Design an enzyme around this catalytic site. Structure first.
Site, mmCIF file in Angstrom:
data_model
loop_
_atom_site.group_PDB
_atom_site.id
_atom_site.type_symbol
_atom_site.label_atom_id
_atom_site.label_comp_id
_atom_site.label_asym_id
_atom_site.label_seq_id
_atom_site.Cartn_x
_atom_site.Cartn_y
_atom_site.Cartn_z
ATOM 1 N N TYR B 273 36.424 45.032 -51.841
ATOM 2 C CA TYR B 273 37.372 44.267 -51.034
ATOM 3 C C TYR B 273 38.589 43.868 -51.841
ATOM 4 C CZ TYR B 273 33.259 43.441 -48.055
ATOM 5 O OH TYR B 273 32.135 43.583 -47.277
ATOM 6 N N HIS B 281 37.637 44.019 -43.924
ATOM 7 C CA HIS B 281 36.740 45.119 -44.250
ATOM 8 C C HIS B 281 36.929 45.500 -45.706
ATOM 9 C CE1 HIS B 281 35.294 46.098 -40.196
ATOM 10 N NE2 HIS B 281 36.528 45.897 -39.765
ATOM 11 N N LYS B 312 37.365 53.938 -44.543
ATOM 12 C CA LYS B 312 37.521 53.481 -45.916
ATOM 13 C C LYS B 312 37.928 54.651 -46.809
ATOM 14 C CE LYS B 312 33.886 50.058 -45.144
ATOM 15 N NZ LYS B 312 34.827 48.971 -44.723
#
Lengths: 337, 337
Positions: B273, B281, B312
């Site tokens: 993060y 997220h 991601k």
């Protein structure tokens, strides 16, 4: 709150009324001395304020109880994460040794699972281990559920289950990547073998071995000499891992009328179609292993998460004997419990 | 159609007008004798009817040309699948040795890629190899693109790129799974360390080592004795693979203000993060390796497809020296070309 006494690693609830009430919610095991609660059960009941625990005359807080149980068994918090989540999710988990699992869990009148707990890093296992886990619940009403706990106690659940399957030659010029068919290949193409480019059909290595074995093509060397099935297996396996085991799975599926192609793009050895690839999505993503193949928690997560992302079923094909052959199929399904 | 003569593995186009026309579409390399076409270029032009090829006085069909080129070089159809797809997709690919790649490809005035072709099974490589591929295009306008061809000639493309990162103690009772903090943990919790359950903070193994090294916790044995950072590393690494390398990456990221947690559920060692996990997220999924770690085409496909499925970025952290430490980060991005 019910009153319990910590004796060793069990909490005993002597009061008949409280013991009966707790047992009616499937907590504990009756004993000669009264209801005996497992550590997971005692801690859960203590955390939600339904149980007070003493050791001797000393009140043990939920925090102190966790501390005690972790010191006694370093795997306790891993098991407990699953236990508490199952209780939260409506299940009644019973610790015990039945089925070789950490818990048997019940929900409603029809849901029964045997829960195998795995820690992200600490638990290694083989394909043979999976077969043995499955064998223990075979023919019972219990499903095998694998619960994986990551280092920070987040959870994922999987159902592992048995899968039972249903179901004048063209010249093929062999090369490192399979074989090339330049003439009279339309029949093979329409039966979904090979990959057409322009006016040539490329057969991949398994297709080349299979169609040779089944008497569908005549494979040849650059000098025009035949190659046997064994010569093809020997040729292709030099730089391709697990080739002979992969081949018997390719052959088993294809014999049965499945269409088998590379599963690379979906994270497997094979993608497998029921009938018509031009019409349908492939149904299965298949990895081929042998019983002594080492597997990991990471395999289970990644294989199923990938398969789910494309709405396919992940299947582990275990080649137990290459030469007979003997093959068993295990489905892994990522599941919300 | 332009007329070409096959000489060795090149096709020569002697006609000045036709050679100029072909070269204006970035086909071929000028030579003293005329425009010289690479096999991929000659075959592509021949398949689309823009080139007729003779060998001596014999006309070579597109099918025969494919046959010849595969016999000469078994990797040709693998390269050619990429070449033809790049041409289809609007790129102008130039075969050559520059950058150590199969092609340099151009599109518009601004798009420039160096294309490294990998075969599903036949190409093995290490993390060091990736660093070396990247070094060759470093400081140039070319992006490194890895093109993976599966056994049935379907394709996937990846951009590999450099990632440069930005950016009285509580008692911790050490156990196999990290450590437990029962008192005065609220500050650490608010700074996103650990996993609170009830009124206890669980620190995972890397968190335990890190917070010890940084003077944020006092780790203790069950008898109340301190443990050093080295004692913790030794303790945790016994059953956890790559622990010391994983730790220096955990520490590097956390030092810089990232929040690092288990990446298990997204197929990595870490999820990372930028600032506030309760709000955001995780941005990266990170795998830690060393330069000699063997990688595969399967790693690239699976890591990026998983990361993409949860929006991601997948990052390979290469620990080049554990003790200094020296670490470099490489992003892998699945890309539509």
């Amino acid at each position: 709150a019910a009153k319990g006494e910590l004796v060793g690693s069990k909490v005993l609830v002597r009061n008949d009324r409280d013991a009966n009430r707790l047992y009616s919610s499937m907590y504990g095991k009756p004993s000669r001395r009264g209801l005996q609660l497992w550590p997971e059960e005692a801690l859960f009941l203590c955390e939600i304020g339904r149980l007070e625990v003493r050791s001797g005359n000393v009140r043990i807080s939920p925090e102190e109880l966790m501390d005690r149980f972790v010191e006694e068994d370093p795997r306790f918090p891993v098991r407990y994460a699953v236990y508490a989540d199952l209780r939260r999710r409506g299940w009644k988990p019973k610790p015990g040794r039945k089925f070789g699992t950490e818990f048997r869990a019940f929900r409603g009148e029809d849901e029964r699972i045997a829960v195998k707990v795995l820690q992200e890093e600490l638990d290694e296992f083989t394909a043979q281990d999976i077969l043995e886990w499955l064998k223990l619940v075979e023919g019972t009403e219990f499903e095998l559920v694998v619960a994986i706990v990551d280092n920070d106690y987040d959870l994922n659940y999987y159902v592992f289950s048995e899968l039972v399957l249903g179901g004048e030659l063209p010249r093929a010029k062999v090369f490192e990547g399979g074989s090339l068919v330049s003439k009279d290949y339309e029949d093979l193409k329409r039966r979904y073998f090979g990959t057409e480019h322009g006016n040539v059909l490329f057969l991949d290595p398994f297709e080349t071995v299979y169609l040779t074995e089944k008497g569908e093509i005549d494979p040849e060397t650059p000098e025009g000499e035949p190659m046997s099935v064994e010569e093809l297996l020997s040729f292709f396996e030099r730089r391709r891992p697990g080739f002979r085991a992969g081949y018997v799975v390719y052959r088993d599926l294809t014999e049965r009328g499945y269409v088998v192609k590379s599963g690379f793009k979906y994270g497997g050895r094979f993608r497998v179609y029921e009938e018509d690839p031009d019409r349908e999505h492939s149904k299965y993503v298949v990895r081929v292993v042998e019983p002594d193949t080492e597997l990991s928690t990471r395999d289970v997560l990644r294989a199923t998460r990938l398969a789910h992302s494309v709405r396919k079923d992940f299947v582990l094909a275990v080649v137990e004997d290459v030469e007979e052959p003997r093959i068993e199929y295990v489905m892994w399904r990522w599941k919300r419990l």
